[PDB]
């Protein structure tokens, strides 16, 4: 419940920076599979960080 | 399998126009630049002009900006340079290749460019 | 606007020694330089990029020595797939290939 959000902001985040990494970027990116995964799983340890900034 | 299959050679009449496609397998180019780039026969390689075929984006080198044109189409996993107003000088050999904005992972076949009277 | 030299047209080797390419570039151009090989009836393909990193499926023996206004391509071990032809190339402000060196076999 927390945490279906999460992993949807998380998808928004990742594949948005997939696709700005790709367009400018000035090698090719292959795997971009692997590139979006560790985004992605990034993303999410970065959204339960900051929403505990939002301490009592 | 990665591969980028181009059209065959052309022998065109100076002044004339010609579009040269390239087609891509095995990866997206809806994710991707495709770059052309001429090597005269002999000389060494010029680059021309880049497309992304998704964002249907283009940028052309200052040399070739009245010359060429790139152009694209997203379902036919196909881009297109066409080339205006040739000479003797355009005579070359032209590759598309996939990579980023300036580095190039797999170049294409090259396709041979005579102009001629 | 930018100009790489390749001051070798040639460069002399037999199979199994050590060999260079070189570039010189005529002004800065940090780590943005990468090398090609064209084997007669070939399109390139991409042995270095940023000057330095070795290419997916590239073999050890290409390894890169850059940065600045000065370049390097080494082969460890020359053989029969390295008897080509070599560019470098820059990309930090605009695309500039190198005049292109032909490997040969010494006699």
């Known amino acids: 419940s927390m945490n279906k959000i999460g992993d949807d902001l998380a998808e928004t985040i990742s594949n948005e920076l997939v696709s700005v990494l790709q367009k400018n970027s000035p090698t090719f990116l292959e795997s971009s599979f692997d590139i979006k995964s560790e985004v992605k799983k990034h993303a999410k340890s970065m959204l339960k960080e900051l929403i505990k900034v939002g301490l009592p | 399998q990665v591969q980028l299959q181009q059209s065959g050679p052309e022998l065109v009449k100076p002044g004339a126009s010609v579009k040269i496609s390239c087609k891509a397998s095995?990866?997206?180019?809806?994710?991707?630049?495709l770059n052309w780039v001429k090597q005269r026969p002999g000389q060494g390689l010029e680059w021309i002009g880049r497309i992304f075929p998704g964002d249907g984006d283009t940028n052309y080198n200052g040399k070739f900006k009245g010359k060429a044109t790139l152009t694209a189409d997203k379902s036919s996993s196909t881009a297109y340079l066409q080339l205006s107003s040739l000479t003797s000088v355009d005579s070359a050999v032209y590759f598309c290749?996939?990579?980023?904005?300036?580095?190039?992972?797999?170049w294409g076949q090259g396709t041979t460019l005579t102009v001629s009277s | 606007d930018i100009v790489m030299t390749q001051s070798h047209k040639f460069m002399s080797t037999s199979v199994g020694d050590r060999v260079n390419i070189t570039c010189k570039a005529s002004?800065?151009?940090?780590?943005?330089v990468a090398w090609y090989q064209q084997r007669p009836g070939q399109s390139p393909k991409l042995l270095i990029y940023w000057a330095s990193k070795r290419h997916t499926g590239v073999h050890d023996r290409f390894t890169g020595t850059g940065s600045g206004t000065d370049f390097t391509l080494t082969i460890s071990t020359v053989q029969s797939e390295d008897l080509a032809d070599y560019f470098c190339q820059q990309y930090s402000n605009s695309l500039t290939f190198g005049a292109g060196t032909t490997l040969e076999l010494s006699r």
């Open positions: 290749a996939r990579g980023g904005t300036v580095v190039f992972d797999y």
């Open positions: 095995g990866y997206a180019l809806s994710s991707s630049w």
């Open positions: 002004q800065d151009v940090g780590i943005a």
